[PDB]
Amino acid sequence: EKIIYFAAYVITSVDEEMRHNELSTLEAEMAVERKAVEDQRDGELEARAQKLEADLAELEAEGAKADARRKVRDGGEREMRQIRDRAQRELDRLEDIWSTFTKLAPKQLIVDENLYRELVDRYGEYFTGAM
Amino acid sequence: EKIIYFAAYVITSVDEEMRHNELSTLEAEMAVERKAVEDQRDGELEARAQKLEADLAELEAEGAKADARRKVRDGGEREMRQIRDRAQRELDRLEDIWSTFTKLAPKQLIVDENLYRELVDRYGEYFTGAMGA
């Protein structure tokens, strides 16, 4: 085999009717979780933007040269890109968990343990599978 | 015509590209709003059930008669039905607004003023409508 992993878990049973019944409640719970990620992110971004505005205003009061101002400006932008990028990672991971849960069907092979373990804690009741 | 209404609005154009692009975001946003209704509902149901239990206990300590304890039981169940029913009407309305927006297409005739007004406030950028027939 050309697929290399620690362990695989096959999917045998999915309670489609039960999942179907609670899907709306489950989709809302994921959107609440997603929005708390986006809200934390927006809060961090605004705080960083304020810090950068005050840092530049400080350099100006001190009559610093353009190069010093540019470095602060560039540094702030990089930090804010990191905040966006880190948050995107967390959002993409939740999208993957939700996507795998929603399209969960028997004869599927789950070959990343962290993903498998995420499916169990969040949706253990709706499925059964074996190593 | 045998269809009766105050005033109707033809959809003239739908910005499908943007709807398609913002759909995922819009959908989570509706689901959050939907859940806020459901959470309020559940809180009220749970608190009201506690009340009914305590109220029955109180009739017990005062040694009230059965027909008295029953009317308070039935009045409790009634109110709890009303909590469930009222919130369901609100959920039904949110479901309709969202359903209408997703399947919204040129030439569609929107004939309830309150629905139109909700569509415009929630998703005004996405579509164009004219009152004239």
Side-chain angles (χ1 to χ4, degrees):
Chain A
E1 191 70 295
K2 286 186 49 167
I3 313 305
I4 279 70
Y5 47 83
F6 281 123
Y9 300 89
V10 173
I11 294 295
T12 65
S13 64
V14 172
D15 183 333
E16 297 214 35
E17 291 78 17
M18 184 200 190
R19 163 175 92 190
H20 161 84
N21 284 357
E22 289 284 50
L23 187 71
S24 55
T25 295
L26 288 182
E27 175 211 8
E29 283 171 351
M30 176 58 75
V32 161
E33 174 171 7
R34 293 180 59 87
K35 171 163 116 112
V37 168
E38 295 167 327
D39 282 356
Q40 179 59 216
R41 171 195 67 199
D42 289 344
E44 291 192 52
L45 285 169
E46 282 306 311
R48 195 60 186 74
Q50 278 187 4
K51 178 183 191 327
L52 169 50
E53 177 172 333
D55 287 348
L56 294 171
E58 176 65 15
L59 280 182
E60 167 127 34
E62 300 179 343
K65 267 165 166 165
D67 58 330
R69 292 167 205 231
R70 297 191 212 287
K71 175 186 184 178
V72 168
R73 177 200 64 187
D74 297 345
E77 186 56 42
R78 291 187 188 91
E79 277 178 31
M80 292 211 274
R81 282 165 177 176
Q82 287 182 32
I83 290 161
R84 280 188 203 93
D85 291 348
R86 284 175 182 130
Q88 194 61 38
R89 292 185 178 90
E90 178 49 48
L91 290 169
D92 295 340
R93 196 175 178 264
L94 298 186
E95 186 199 322
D96 285 353
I97 296 173
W98 180 246
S99 164
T100 297
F101 167 74
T102 205
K103 287 177 302 199
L104 202 63
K107 292 142 278 205
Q108 275 181 349
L109 199 50
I110 309 186
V111 294
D112 188 300
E113 298 181 306
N114 286 3
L115 173 55
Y116 193 64
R117 153 221 170 209
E118 285 286 347
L119 291 174
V120 167
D121 315 1
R122 303 166 173 273
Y123 323 107
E125 305 64 314
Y126 314 67
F127 78 106
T128 296
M131 177 189 295
Chain B
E1 248 200 300
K2 313 152 21 188
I3 183 182
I4 308 97
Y5 55 85
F6 279 130
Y9 302 81
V10 178
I11 310 294
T12 47
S13 73
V14 180
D15 184 337
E16 295 200 9
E17 71 207 14
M18 175 190 50
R19 169 175 70 176
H20 182 264
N21 291 338
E22 288 308 299
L23 193 73
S24 199
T25 295
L26 299 173
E27 183 152 27
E29 190 179 357
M30 168 62 66
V32 166
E33 184 175 350
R34 198 175 70 239
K35 187 184 166 59
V37 169
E38 300 178 277
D39 278 11
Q40 178 67 30
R41 180 196 61 206
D42 288 346
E44 294 193 33
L45 280 162
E46 174 200 61
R48 184 61 179 89
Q50 267 177 15
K51 184 181 189 320
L52 177 64
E53 171 176 331
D55 279 353
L56 292 169
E58 179 66 20
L59 289 199
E60 186 173 347
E62 309 169 344
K65 292 212 177 213
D67 65 314
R69 302 185 65 260
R70 280 163 184 149
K71 172 34 184 49
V72 78
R73 166 175 65 68
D74 297 338
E77 180 58 7
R78 180 178 180 272
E79 278 195 352
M80 297 211 282
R81 280 165 184 170
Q82 276 178 37
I83 292 169
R84 273 187 288 246
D85 290 5
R86 277 179 182 118
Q88 189 61 45
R89 291 176 213 128
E90 188 44 41
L91 296 176
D92 289 343
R93 180 168 262 243
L94 294 178
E95 180 187 358
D96 277 349
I97 284 160
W98 173 254
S99 156
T100 296
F101 169 76
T102 58
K103 305 189 295 184
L104 193 62
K107 296 202 226 302
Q108 274 174 352
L109 210 60
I110 305 189
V111 304
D112 180 283
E113 277 173 332
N114 283 306
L115 181 58
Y116 192 73
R117 161 197 141 268
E118 294 283 356
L119 275 198
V120 169
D121 292 11
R122 287 174 149 88
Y123 318 104
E125 189 176 44
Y126 297 83
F127 75 106
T128 302
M131 181 189 194

Short mmCIF file of all heavy atoms in Angstrom, two decimals, chain A residues 34-52 79-80 83-84 87:
data_model
loop_
_atom_site.label_atom_id
_atom_site.label_comp_id
_atom_site.label_asym_id
_atom_site.label_seq_id
_atom_site.Cartn_x
_atom_site.Cartn_y
_atom_site.Cartn_z
N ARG A 34 -17.95 28.10 15.44
CA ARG A 34 -17.21 28.81 14.40
C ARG A 34 -17.21 30.29 14.68
O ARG A 34 -16.20 30.93 14.47
CB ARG A 34 -17.79 28.55 13.01
CG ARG A 34 -17.62 27.13 12.51
CD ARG A 34 -18.21 26.97 11.14
NE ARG A 34 -17.59 27.86 10.18
CZ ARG A 34 -16.48 27.56 9.51
NH1 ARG A 34 -15.90 26.39 9.70
NH2 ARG A 34 -15.96 28.43 8.65
N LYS A 35 -18.34 30.83 15.14
CA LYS A 35 -18.44 32.27 15.33
C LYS A 35 -17.64 32.72 16.54
O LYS A 35 -17.12 33.83 16.56
CB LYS A 35 -19.90 32.73 15.46
CG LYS A 35 -20.02 34.19 15.86
CD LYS A 35 -21.41 34.76 15.60
CE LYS A 35 -22.10 35.16 16.91
NZ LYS A 35 -22.27 36.64 17.02
N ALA A 36 -17.47 31.85 17.53
CA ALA A 36 -16.62 32.21 18.66
C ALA A 36 -15.15 32.30 18.21
O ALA A 36 -14.40 33.12 18.72
CB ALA A 36 -16.79 31.24 19.80
N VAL A 37 -14.74 31.46 17.25
CA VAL A 37 -13.41 31.59 16.64
C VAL A 37 -13.28 32.93 15.92
O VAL A 37 -12.31 33.65 16.13
CB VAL A 37 -13.10 30.44 15.63
CG1 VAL A 37 -11.85 30.77 14.81
CG2 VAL A 37 -12.93 29.09 16.33
N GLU A 38 -14.25 33.27 15.07
CA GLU A 38 -14.27 34.54 14.35
C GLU A 38 -14.38 35.77 15.26
O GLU A 38 -13.88 36.84 14.93
CB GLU A 38 -15.43 34.58 13.36
CG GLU A 38 -15.33 33.56 12.23
CD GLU A 38 -16.63 33.39 11.44
OE1 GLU A 38 -17.74 33.51 12.02
OE2 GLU A 38 -16.52 33.11 10.23
N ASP A 39 -15.04 35.62 16.40
CA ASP A 39 -15.19 36.74 17.32
C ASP A 39 -13.89 36.97 18.09
O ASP A 39 -13.46 38.11 18.26
CB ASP A 39 -16.37 36.51 18.27
CG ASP A 39 -17.72 36.78 17.60
OD1 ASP A 39 -17.73 37.21 16.42
OD2 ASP A 39 -18.76 36.57 18.26
N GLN A 40 -13.26 35.88 18.53
CA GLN A 40 -11.94 36.00 19.15
C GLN A 40 -10.96 36.67 18.18
O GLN A 40 -10.19 37.55 18.57
CB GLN A 40 -11.43 34.62 19.57
CG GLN A 40 -10.05 34.58 20.20
CD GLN A 40 -9.91 35.43 21.46
OE1 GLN A 40 -8.86 36.03 21.70
NE2 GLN A 40 -10.96 35.47 22.29
N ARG A 41 -11.01 36.26 16.90
CA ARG A 41 -10.12 36.79 15.87
C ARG A 41 -10.31 38.26 15.63
O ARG A 41 -9.34 39.00 15.52
CB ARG A 41 -10.34 36.07 14.54
CG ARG A 41 -9.61 36.72 13.36
CD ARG A 41 -10.14 36.21 12.01
NE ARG A 41 -11.51 36.67 11.81
CZ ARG A 41 -12.38 36.13 10.97
NH1 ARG A 41 -12.02 35.12 10.18
NH2 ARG A 41 -13.61 36.62 10.89
N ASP A 42 -11.55 38.68 15.51
CA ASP A 42 -11.86 40.07 15.27
C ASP A 42 -11.41 40.93 16.44
O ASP A 42 -10.92 42.02 16.25
CB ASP A 42 -13.33 40.26 14.91
CG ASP A 42 -13.65 39.71 13.52
OD1 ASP A 42 -12.72 39.46 12.74
OD2 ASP A 42 -14.84 39.52 13.21
N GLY A 43 -11.58 40.41 17.65
CA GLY A 43 -11.16 41.12 18.83
C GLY A 43 -9.65 41.31 18.86
O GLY A 43 -9.18 42.37 19.18
N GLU A 44 -8.91 40.26 18.51
CA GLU A 44 -7.46 40.35 18.48
C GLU A 44 -7.00 41.32 17.42
O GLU A 44 -6.07 42.07 17.63
CB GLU A 44 -6.81 38.98 18.27
CG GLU A 44 -6.95 38.02 19.43
CD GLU A 44 -6.05 36.81 19.31
OE1 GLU A 44 -4.84 36.99 19.10
OE2 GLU A 44 -6.54 35.68 19.45
N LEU A 45 -7.65 41.29 16.27
CA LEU A 45 -7.30 42.17 15.16
C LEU A 45 -7.49 43.63 15.49
O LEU A 45 -6.65 44.44 15.16
CB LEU A 45 -8.09 41.81 13.91
CG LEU A 45 -7.69 40.56 13.13
CD1 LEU A 45 -8.75 40.23 12.10
CD2 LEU A 45 -6.34 40.73 12.48
N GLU A 46 -8.59 43.97 16.14
CA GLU A 46 -8.84 45.35 16.51
C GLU A 46 -7.83 45.84 17.53
O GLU A 46 -7.36 46.95 17.46
CB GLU A 46 -10.26 45.56 17.01
CG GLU A 46 -11.27 45.62 15.88
CD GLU A 46 -10.91 46.65 14.83
OE1 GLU A 46 -10.62 47.80 15.21
OE2 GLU A 46 -10.94 46.32 13.63
N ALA A 47 -7.50 44.98 18.49
CA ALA A 47 -6.52 45.33 19.51
C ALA A 47 -5.16 45.58 18.89
O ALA A 47 -4.48 46.51 19.25
CB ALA A 47 -6.44 44.25 20.55
N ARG A 48 -4.77 44.72 17.95
CA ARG A 48 -3.49 44.87 17.28
C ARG A 48 -3.45 46.13 16.44
O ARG A 48 -2.43 46.79 16.37
CB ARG A 48 -3.13 43.64 16.46
CG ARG A 48 -1.68 43.60 16.04
CD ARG A 48 -0.76 43.60 17.24
NE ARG A 48 0.64 43.71 16.87
CZ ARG A 48 1.22 44.83 16.45
NH1 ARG A 48 0.50 45.93 16.32
NH2 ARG A 48 2.50 44.84 16.14
N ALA A 49 -4.56 46.45 15.79
CA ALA A 49 -4.63 47.64 14.98
C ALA A 49 -4.47 48.89 15.84
O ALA A 49 -3.83 49.83 15.42
CB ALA A 49 -5.93 47.69 14.19
N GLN A 50 -5.06 48.89 17.04
CA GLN A 50 -4.94 50.02 17.96
C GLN A 50 -3.51 50.20 18.45
O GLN A 50 -3.01 51.30 18.49
CB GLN A 50 -5.89 49.86 19.14
CG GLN A 50 -7.31 50.28 18.86
CD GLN A 50 -8.18 50.28 20.11
OE1 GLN A 50 -7.69 50.04 21.21
NE2 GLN A 50 -9.46 50.55 19.93
N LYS A 51 -2.86 49.09 18.80
CA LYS A 51 -1.47 49.08 19.22
C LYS A 51 -0.54 49.65 18.13
O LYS A 51 0.34 50.46 18.40
CB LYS A 51 -1.04 47.67 19.57
CG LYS A 51 0.40 47.57 19.95
CD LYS A 51 0.82 46.14 20.23
CE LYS A 51 2.17 46.10 20.88
NZ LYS A 51 3.01 47.22 20.37
N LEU A 52 -0.78 49.25 16.90
CA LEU A 52 -0.01 49.76 15.78
C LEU A 52 -0.29 51.25 15.57
O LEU A 52 0.61 52.02 15.24
CB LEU A 52 -0.32 48.95 14.51
CG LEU A 52 0.18 49.48 13.16
CD1 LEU A 52 1.65 49.83 13.21
CD2 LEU A 52 -0.08 48.45 12.04
N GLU A 79 1.96 40.65 11.89
CA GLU A 79 1.29 40.08 13.05
C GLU A 79 -0.19 39.92 12.80
O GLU A 79 -0.79 38.92 13.18
CB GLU A 79 1.52 40.93 14.30
CG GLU A 79 2.84 40.65 14.99
CD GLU A 79 3.07 41.53 16.20
OE1 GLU A 79 2.08 41.93 16.84
OE2 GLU A 79 4.24 41.84 16.49
N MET A 80 -0.80 40.90 12.16
CA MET A 80 -2.20 40.80 11.88
C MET A 80 -2.55 39.75 10.82
O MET A 80 -3.63 39.17 10.85
CB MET A 80 -2.71 42.16 11.48
CG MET A 80 -2.65 43.09 12.74
SD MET A 80 -4.04 44.27 12.53
CE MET A 80 -3.17 45.45 11.57
N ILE A 83 -2.68 36.52 12.69
CA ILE A 83 -3.91 36.35 13.44
C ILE A 83 -5.00 35.83 12.50
O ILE A 83 -5.75 34.93 12.84
CB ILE A 83 -4.35 37.67 14.11
CG1 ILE A 83 -3.40 38.02 15.25
CG2 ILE A 83 -5.75 37.54 14.67
CD1 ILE A 83 -3.47 39.48 15.65
N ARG A 84 -5.06 36.38 11.29
CA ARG A 84 -6.01 35.90 10.29
C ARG A 84 -5.71 34.47 9.89
O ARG A 84 -6.63 33.65 9.79
CB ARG A 84 -6.00 36.80 9.05
CG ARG A 84 -6.81 38.06 9.23
CD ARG A 84 -6.96 38.83 7.96
NE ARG A 84 -7.25 40.23 8.23
CZ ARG A 84 -6.31 41.16 8.31
NH1 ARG A 84 -5.03 40.82 8.15
NH2 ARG A 84 -6.63 42.43 8.55
N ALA A 87 -6.40 31.80 12.66
CA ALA A 87 -7.83 31.62 12.82
C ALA A 87 -8.35 30.81 11.65
O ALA A 87 -9.21 29.95 11.83
CB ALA A 87 -8.55 32.97 12.93
#
